[PDB]
Design a protein around this ligand. Structure first.
Ligand SMILES: [Ca+2]
Ligand SMILES: [Ca+2]
Length: 109
């Protein structure tokens, strides 16, 4: 759904930089693809897609396929890479990244 809403080549540079098995962080990746360039509104729409279980929330499982909107199966978290996104974006440390938390980590990425 966000594959046509992106630049295409921007997703090939971020994923090509993290493809390693633990080379993903979340800042250099999103900063590359260009998700922060989107507008807070078009960001709430990017998150609505991150929301895998349609629960207006980004749970740890979402993090596993966080880059799914860009690729049904693009970057497959290594597990440790998923433990970074969760402890790098979850500021309140609640276990769920709502929008403001997500759009805040997508723009500061
Ligand atoms: Ca959710
Ligand atoms: Ca949170």
């Amino acid at each position: 759904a966000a594959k046509d809403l992106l630049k295409a080549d921007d997703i090939k540079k971020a994923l090509d930089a993290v493809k390693a098995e633990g080379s993903f962080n979340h800042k250099k990746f999103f900063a590359l693809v260009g998700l922060k360039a989107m507008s807070a509104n078009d960001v709430k729409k990017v998150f609505k897609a991150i929301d895998a279980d349609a629960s207006g929330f980004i749970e740890e499982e979402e993090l596993k396929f966080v880059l799914k909107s860009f690729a049904a199966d693009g970057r497959d978290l290594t597990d440790a890479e998923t433990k970074a996104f969760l402890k790098a974006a979850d500021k309140d440390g609640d276990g769920k990244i709502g929008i403001d938390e997500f759009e805040t980590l997508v723009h500061e990425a």
